[PDB]
Design a protein around this ligand. Structure first.
Ligand SMILES: Nc1nc2c(ncn2[C@@H]2O[C@@H]3COP(=O)(O)O[C@H]3[C@H]2O)c(=O)[nH]1
Ligand code: NA
Length: 142
């Protein structure tokens, strides 16, 4: 039932959040609120996490393992990194396909909770906005 899902979605979250530097940036009530909303997920190596052109309704914090980003300047994102923010900020479709490189643990943040986070923390909202710009900049360069 729903109770099992709620426990499964949370049971790992606090342990894993220590691996997200972005959230060292948060007041404690804000961090706890966000951690309750996060959902921890493990994705097997090779599996697609988000696909270019599809709608985006969440973003992801990498907490164990790594992902591969298929862009003009391909990159790997490991613990502490994040992806999926661009679609949440622009309302546009996913701009690149991201796949598990090794088996990867992620903390998933749904759009509503991303908006609450950004409305709560100007520092963090700006980090997301600048990260999206950086990534667009990387894409623009051969
Ligand atoms: N377009 C692009 N996305 C990147 C890059 N590096 C990491 N990503 C992430 O891959 C994500 C794909 O989905 P989004 O467009 O929502 O957000 C994207 C970024 O968070 C990059 O160089 N270019
Ligand atoms: Na769920």
């Amino acid at each position: 039932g729903s109770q099992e899902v709620r426990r499964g979605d949370f049971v790992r979250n606090w342990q894993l959040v220590a691996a997200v530097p972005l959230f060292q940036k948060l007041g404690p009530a804000v961090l706890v609120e966000i951690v309750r909303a996060l959902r921890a997920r493990t994705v097997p190596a090779g599996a697609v996490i988000c696909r270019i052109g599809e709608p985006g309704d969440r973003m992801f914090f990498v907490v164990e393992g790594s992902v591969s980003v298929a862009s003009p300047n391909p990159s790997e994102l490991g613990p502490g990194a994040f992806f999926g923010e661009m679609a949440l900020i622009s309302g546009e479709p996913r701009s690149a396909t991201v796949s598990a490189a090794t088996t990867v643990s992620l903390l998933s943040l749904h759009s509503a909770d991303f908006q609450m986070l950004c409305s709560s923390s100007p520092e963090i909202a700006e980090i997301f906005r600048k990260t999206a710009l950086e990534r667009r900049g990387a894409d623009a360069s051969a």
